[PDB]
Amino acid sequence: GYTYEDIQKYLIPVIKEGKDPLGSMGNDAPLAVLSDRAQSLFNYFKQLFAQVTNPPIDAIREQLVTSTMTWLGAEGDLLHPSERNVRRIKLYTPVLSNEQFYALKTIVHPDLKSQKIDVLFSEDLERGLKDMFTQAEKAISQGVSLLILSDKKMNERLTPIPPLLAVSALHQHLIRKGLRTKVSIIVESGEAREVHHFAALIGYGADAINPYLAYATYKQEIDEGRLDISYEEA
């Protein structure tokens, strides 16, 4: 669902200004549910905020209060904890780069295993979700601690589940079966380029995001000539 408008008005400005691009004349387009044009599942979800009983805290000026540390792995015995609660990977930002994602996938430490689950379906969404649950529970029984939901290897016969829906279903199933604490759900979905999509994924369960599609788009633009800044810096 990329667009040239989306690229030239949301991706290049981020690099140029070091921040999310601004605007005015707030959205007046019809909701996704009413819009005739096909829309991704993300548009159906609207963010929330605090009005009364609590203030909206600031970030830039109150940076000392923020905390972006993320832990990947499996938690240990909370009531009697010793060193295995902390024998885990810890990140500074939820987002990941290609090199970082490949390092996580290639880590072969026996305690921190990695599994790749193809989040794809053919005709039946219920069948796809149940199959994904089966892979998840089989991997947990084997002893994995990291799950990789990848939309790659997708062709004309296999289509991708909405990543938000897939992540929410996996998280709810894991919570219900009492195994979420033993795993870490990393998500690799192409449809992740807005802070809205990112925040939705983290809020609904995703441990980290690897916008490989956005990185490839930046590679293509740099190869073409636009966005002269280097690939790693970008």
Binding site: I60, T66, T68, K90, L91
Partner: peptide, 11 residues
């Protein structure tokens, strides 16, 4: 120091 060694601030 984190797992990756990243140390730069955010803002």
């Amino acid at each position: 120091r984190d797992s990756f060694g990243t140390v730069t601030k955010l803002f």
